[PDB]
Every structure is written in C-alpha cells, then in structure tokens.
C-alpha cells in the first residue's frame, strides 16, 4: 500500500519544486532534498518492516507487499505493484542515488533550476516504478516514461563546452535506441498476452497470470529474444551499447544526471524478473549466446576503456564491462551467481556514482575532460585524487569493496556451471585492472602537461567531501560485511532460480 506513495512522492515533490521556483532560485533544491528524504526513509521503513532476513522461499510468486488497482478494465490491465527483497534493494539504491544527485547539483543558481529538478524527480519516480511494478503495461510505461525527461536534460542542460548539435545527437541516439527496444518489448508482451488469451480466454497483462501458458518452441524463443534485445540495449550489451558513452560525455557537468538516469539497474532486474521466469526453456536454450555476448562485452569494454582520452567515456565503458559480467551471471542458473550479480550491481552503482561525482568535481577544477592535458594532480589538489584512486581501486574488483565480492560470487557460480567462460571472464578482470591503472597513470600521476595542471587548485568543500566519504564508507561496509544484503534478497533469488532450474 506504501508502494504507490513510493512512486508518486518524487512526482508530487517535483511538482512543488517546479511551482516553488517563483519563491526563489535556491528554493526547489531544498524541496527536492526533502522529497528524496521521504522516499529514502520510506524505502528503509519497508526494509525494516518487511522482515527479509528470516524469509523462506515460497516460489514464484512470493511478494512481500502488493498493491492492486484497475487501470484499463477493457484489457484487464491493473496498476499492480509488488515489492520483494530484490526490488526493495533496488529501490533503496535508487533513493540513495537520488539523494546523491540532489546533493551533487546543489551549486546551481540558474534561472530554470525548477524544470531541471522536476525532470530529475520524474526520472527517479520512473525508475522506482520500473523496480516496483510487475504488471507488464505498467512496467513498460515506467520504462518508457523514464526516457523523456532524461532526453530533455541531455539535449538542453548538457555539456556547455560542446556544441548543441553534439548534445542533440547523443540525446536522440539514446532515446531512439531505448524507445525502439521498448517497442520490441511491447510486441513481445502483446504476443504473450494474445497467446495466453487464445489458450485460456481471459484478458490479463498481469505478471503472475502470464507465467503458466502453453509456450510452443519457436514462439517462446522470439518473445525471449525481444525481451533480451530491450534489456540488452538498456544493460548495455554489445553491439547495442553506443548510446551510453555518448550520453555520458554530453551529460550536464553537475554529475547528478549520470546518477539519476543512466545508472539504472533495471535491465538485469528485468532479466531476472521477466526473461528468466516467463521463458525458462527459451532462456535455457539461449544461455550460451548471452554468456558469450557477456564475454565479448567485457573484453570490448576493457579495450575501449584503455583507449579513451576522455575520463567520462572511460567510466561509461567500465559500466559496459561490469554489466557484461552481470549478463554472464544471469544465464548461469545458479543461486551463488545470482547473489553475486546483485552484489556486483549494487557495488557498481555505488562505485560508478562516486567516480562520476569525482570526475564532475575534477572538471569543475581544471575546466577540461581530456586526460592528455592533465598530470601530476596529486600534488596540486587536496582530497579528490586520493578518493578517485580509491574508487578506481574499487572498480577493478578489490577486496574491501563490494565489486570483488560480487564478481567472485558470480565467477564461483559460473565455474560451478561453466568453466571456460569463467576463466575468460577472470582474464577480463585482469584487463579491468589494466585499464584502471592506465586511467590513474594518465590522470593523476606524472608531470604537468599543461598550465591548468601546473597551478595550485581549490579543494573540495564539505558537502562533496561528505557525500564521497559516505560512498566510501558504504563501499567498505558492503565489501567487508555483505551478509545483510545477501539475506535481504535470498527469497526472490531463490524463487527465480528454482523456477528457472526445476522447470527444465
């Protein structure tokens, strides 16, 4: 019953943020901070109230908290929300990243900050609705509504150092990719619904009603392929990955925008929630192709991330490689690999958020993103080089940070099922360390290759230091004590894996 308010509270908060811009320029940032405070507090209240640590696995479906309302009775379509351990973890991470976003755009005294904030909270509400909703029309609607404000910020508020045509091109590329793949997802959903209606005789778009359908081999493969195409371009999965670094490099320079819209963990959530339980035989047949696509994505993203002179593009390719690791984890059919995928997803979100915030602050210091004009910044800047080194240590899979834990549980489960892809992926982790060290050598260590790095630069203020240190503390706690996160999502992972492997 609290899930509709979880979705709408960012929307009404953004509405008051837009309406309160007449009261003052510095007003809507506070209102956005309070409504993310209520969103995060309600998510933590659901975490403490649901009782997730001692929850048994009752099979699919087993929802901790559900809400039902009719939306289109003609098609039998409901606003149907359902939260479990995995969705709760994603919602908590989403609210945390929204708080970090509203903190990272605190120094904007622009004339139209109200619409920027409004689009930010609408993005946050859209991704929260993606995580919470299980009805396929509502899931698709949230999936596609979280695109328009993000496209508007990339096109309008983006990288001021570049021309407007480049921002227009990047925003249009991202929106075209995501929306066309959403249309393919809608075709798959519609075909599944029509087959269920032909087999039974009931109009329903609900998730639990569509699982028990007579699925002929060849049609189920096509439905799974459409779902995987959408969740693969939005993961990203190669070659459907060209929009991610274009959207990152032409994003607004505050760094809030990358935390809000691009850093979604929704594609692998859809893979675990929709692609695997609805199509067990199709995914069982398709698993070698998806795992080899994950291998190609990992090594390709490492090879791009070594060869980029732009740091934001480099971190985008880090995201590509880590989501390729998660893609390898999804189609293995192991509980250990799934828990590792969840841990790696949360750790990648935190580490990439810290790297993006530090990159934005660094660009505010030196007024350039090109890594060839900077060097020896350890002796010129106060706090940022050390924290950036910590986050690049985290992003290569270092113990004491959750990325090592997530990747290693992924590889343990994979080697339990497939050995060769595991060993090739672990060599991919060698390449991950290679590009992380290359970025640290090309950015912070060496001699000053220009004049902007030859002068002493101002240090970070208390707010950016506090949010970066909070991210550091959460990364250390996740790396050293990942147990509560594991028992939080032990039930939904158990149900999904049991539905995947006891059905074949």
Ligand X SMILES: CCCCCCCCCCCCCCCCCC(=O)OC[C@H](COP(=O)(O)OCCN)OC(=O)CCCCCCCCCCCCCCCCC
* Among the listed residues 71, 221, 306, 363, the single contact to another protein using CB under 8 A: 306
From ligand X, another protein, none, interface partner of 187 (C-beta below 5 to 8 A by class): ligand X
- CA distances to 7, 22, 118, 234 from 114, in Å: 20, 9, 6, 28
- Judged by DSSP in three states, 237 sits in strand
Which residues, in sequence order, are CB contacts of 413 under 8 Å at separation 6+?
329, 332, 334, 335, 336, 337, 338, 340
408 forms part of the interface with another protein (CB under 8 A)? yes
Among 40, 225, 392, 460, contact with ligand X (rule: CB under 6 A)? 225
For position 429 contacting another protein by CB under 8 A, the verdict is: yes
Among 490, 491, 492, 495, binds another protein (CB under 8 A): 490
Interface with ligand X, residue 274, by CB under 6 A: no
CA distance 393 to 371: 18
Q: How far is the CB of 361 from another protein (least distance, A)?
A: 17
CB of 178 to ligand X, least distance (A): 9
The least distance separating another protein from the CB of residue 17, rounded to whole angstroms, comes to: 36
Q: 193: which 2 tokens?
A: 């619904």
In Å, how far from its chain's centre is CA 43? Answer: 17
Task: Of 319, 385, 396, 395, give the one whose Cα is nearest residue 358.
Answer: 385
For residue 446, is the peptide bond before it cis, meaning its omega torsion is within 30 degrees of 0? Answer: no
Q: Are 401 and 393 in contact (CB under 8 A)?
A: yes
State the binding partner of 238 from another protein, ligand X, none, CB within 5 to 8 A by kind. Answer: another protein
> How far is 36 from 31, CA to CA, in rounded Å?
9
Report the C-alpha gap between 249 and 359 in whole angstroms.
11
Phi-psi region of 79 (alpha: psi -120 to 50; beta: other; left: phi over 0): beta
Q: What are phi and psi of 237, to 5 degrees?
A: -130, 135
429 contact choice in another protein, ligand X, none (CB below 5 to 8 Å, kind-dependent)? another protein
- CA–CA separation, 335 and 149 (whole Å): 36
Tell me which of another protein, ligand X, none is bound by residue 387, counting a contact when its beta carbon lies within the kind-specific cut-off of 5 to 8 angstroms: ligand X
Q: Which of 433, 449, 452, 477 binds another protein (CB under 8 A)?
A: 433
Kindly identify the residues of this chain, within the stretch 330-359, that bind another protein according to CB under 8 A: 335-336, 339
Q: Rule CB under 8 A: say whether 412 interacts with another protein.
A: yes
Residue ranges in 448-487 that form contacts with ligand X under rule CB under 6 A: 472-473, 476-477
Instruction: Tell me how far CA of residue 60 lies from CA of 52, 64, 496, in angstroms.
Output: 16, 12, 7
Nearer CB in complex with ligand X: 223/493: 223
Please report, as residue ranges, which positions from 200 to 239 form the binding site for another protein (by CB under 8 A): 238-239
Of the residues 389, 396, 405, 493, which one makes contact with ligand X according to CB under 6 A: 389
Q: What is the 3-state secondary structure (H, E, C) of 241-287?
A: CCHHHHHHHCCCCCCHHHHHHHCCCHHHHHHHHHHHHHCHHHHHHHH
DSSP-assigned states of every residue in 324-342? HHHHHHHTT--HHHHHHHH
Query: Rounded to the nearest whole angstrom, what is the least distance from the CB of residue 29 to ligand X in the complex?
Result: 27
DSSP notation for 113-168: HHHHHHHHHHHHHHHHHHHHB-SHHHHHHHHHHTTHHHHHHHHHSS-TTS-HHHHH
Nearer to another protein, 283 or 497 (CB): 497
Question: 128, 232, 393, 468: which one contacts another protein (CB under 8 A)?
Answer: 393
Q: Which of 44, 145, 20, 59 is nearest to 94 (CA)?
A: 44
Q: Rounded to the nearest whole angstrom, what is the least distance from the CB of residue 330 to ligand X in the complex?
A: 17
Interface with another protein, residue 430, by CB under 8 A = yes
Q: Is 416 in the site for ligand X (CB under 6 A)?
A: no
Partner that binds at residue 195, options another protein, ligand X, none, CB closer than 5 to 8 Å by kind? ligand X
Binding site for another protein (CB under 8 A): 238-242, 300, 303-304, 306-308, 335-336, 339, 376, 378-379, 382-383, 386, 393, 398-400, 404-405, 408-409, 411-412, 415-416, 419, 422-423, 426-427, 429-430, 433-434, 437-438, 441, 444-447, 481-483, 486, 490
Binding site for ligand X (CB under 6 A): 169, 172-173, 176-177, 180-181, 184, 187-188, 191, 195, 198, 214, 216, 219, 222-223, 225-226, 229, 233, 240, 382-383, 386-387, 389-390, 393, 398-400, 427, 430, 434, 438, 441-442, 472-473, 476-477
């Amino acid at each position: 019953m609290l899930l509709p308010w979880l979705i709408l509270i960012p929307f009404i908060g953004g509405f008051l943020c837009w309406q309160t811009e007449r009261f003052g320029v510095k007003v809507p940032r506070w209102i956005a901070l309070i409504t993310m405070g209520l969103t995060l507090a309600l998510s933590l209240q659901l975490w403490l109230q649901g009782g997730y640590s001692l929850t048994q696995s009752a099979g699919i479906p087993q929802w901790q908290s559900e809400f039902d309302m009719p939306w289109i009775p003609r098609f039998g379509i409901s606003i149907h929300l359902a939260i479990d351990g995995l969705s709760l973890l994603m919602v908590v991470l989403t609210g945390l990243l929204g708080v970090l976003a509203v903190l990272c755009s605190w120094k904007e005294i622009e004339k139209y900050q109200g619409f920027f904030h409004l689009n930010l909270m609408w993005i946050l509400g859209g991704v929260i609705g993606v995580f919470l909703a299980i009805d396929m029309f509502l899931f698709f609607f949230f999936w596609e509504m979280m695109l328009v404000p993000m496209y508007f910020l990339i096109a309008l508020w983006g990288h001021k150092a570049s021309d407007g045509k480049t921002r227009i091109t990047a925003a249009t590329k991202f929106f075209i990719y995501t929306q066309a793949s959403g249309l393919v997802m809608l075709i798959a959903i519609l075909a599944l619904v029509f087959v269920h209606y032909n087999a039974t005789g009931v109009w329903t778009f609900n998730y639990e009603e569509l699982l028990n359908t007579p699925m002929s081999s060849g049609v189920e493969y096509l439905l799974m392929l459409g779902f995987f195409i959408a969740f693969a371009v939005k993961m990203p999965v190669v070659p459907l990955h060209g929009w991610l670094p274009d959207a990152h490099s032409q994003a607004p320079t505050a760094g809030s925008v990358d935390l809000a819209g691009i850093l979604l963990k929704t594609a692998a959530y859809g893979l675990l929630r929709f692609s695997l339980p609805l199509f067990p035989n199709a995914s069982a047949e398709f698993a070698p192709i998806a795992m080899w696509l994950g291998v190609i994505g990992i090594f390709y993203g490492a090879w791009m991330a070594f060869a980029q002179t732009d740091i934001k593009r480099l971190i985008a390719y880090t995201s590509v490689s880590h989501m390729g690791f998660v893609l390898i984890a999804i189609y293995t059919g192991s509980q250990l690999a799934y828990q590792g995928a969840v841990i790696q997803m949360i750790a990648h979100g935190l580490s990439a958020a810290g790297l993006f915030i530090l990159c934005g602050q660094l660009y505010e210091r030196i007024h350039t993103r090109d890594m060839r004009m900077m060097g020896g910044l350890w002796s010129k800047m106060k706090w940022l080089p050390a924290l950036s080194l910590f986050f690049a240590v985290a992003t290569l899979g270092m113990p004491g940070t959750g990325n090592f834990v997530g990747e290693f549980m992924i590889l343990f489960g994979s080697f339990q099922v497939v050995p060769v892809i595991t060993v090739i992926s672990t060599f991919g982790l060698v390449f991950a360390s290679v590009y992380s060290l290359a970025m640290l050598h090309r950015a912070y260590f060496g001699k000053a290759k220009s004049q902007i790095a030859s002068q002493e630069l101002p240090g970070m203020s208390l707010r950016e230091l506090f949010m970066i240190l909070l991210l550091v503390v959460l990364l250390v706690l996740l790396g050293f004590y990942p147990q509560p996160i594991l028992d939080t999502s032990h039930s939904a992972i158990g149900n999904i894996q049991q539905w995947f492997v006891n059905s074949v």
